[PDB]
Design a binder for this molecule. Structure first.
Ligand SMILES: Nc1ncnc2c1ncn2[C@@H]1O[C@H](COP(=O)(O)O)[C@@H](O)[C@H]1O
Length: 124
């Protein structure tokens, strides 16, 4: 199936805009990236940086992942991100999300050759 590297790009990478234009960004993106197909994915972050800048996080600040693996990395710089979080009234199949625009460091798990992000751990 779709590799972990390609799933990370589908779920977390939106190079196309520098920031969330509208308050309907998350409603639109969560649909177009197949994150509301079977269920409403409750929480998801999109990174508004170049794929090259995000892939470079894999040679920045090595930290533990939430799951306790030690292949996680924190971006040295803050990045333009959008936090999508499902509303309290959201019911599948009519998934609804609050869009929150922010500048924060990202933490990603890196694996493979090439050594690229396969998991979005957190923003800080
Ligand atoms: N430390 C880690 N924590 C979670 N997932 C990881 C980690 N390292 C690698 N992965 C991969 O990340 C994918 C899950 O990421 P996600 O869908 O963003 O939760 C799986 O394909 C795992 O193999």
């Amino acid at each position: 199936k779709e590799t972990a590297a390609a799933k990370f790009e589908r779920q977390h990478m939106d190079s196309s805009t520098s920031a969330a234009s509208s308050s309907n960004y998350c409603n639109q993106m969560m649909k177009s990236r197949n994150l509301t197909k079977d269920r409403c994915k409750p929480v998801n972050t999109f990174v508004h940086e170049s794929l090259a800048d995000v892939q470079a996080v894999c040679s920045q600040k090595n930290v533990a992942c939430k799951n306790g693996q030690t292949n996680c990395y924190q971006s040295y710089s803050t990045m333009s991100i959008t936090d999508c979080r499902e509303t309290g009234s959201s019911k599948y199949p009519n998934c609804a999300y609050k869009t929150t625009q922010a500048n924060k460091h990202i933490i990603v798990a890196c694996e493979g050759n090439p050594y690229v992000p396969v998991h979005f751990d957190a923003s800080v």
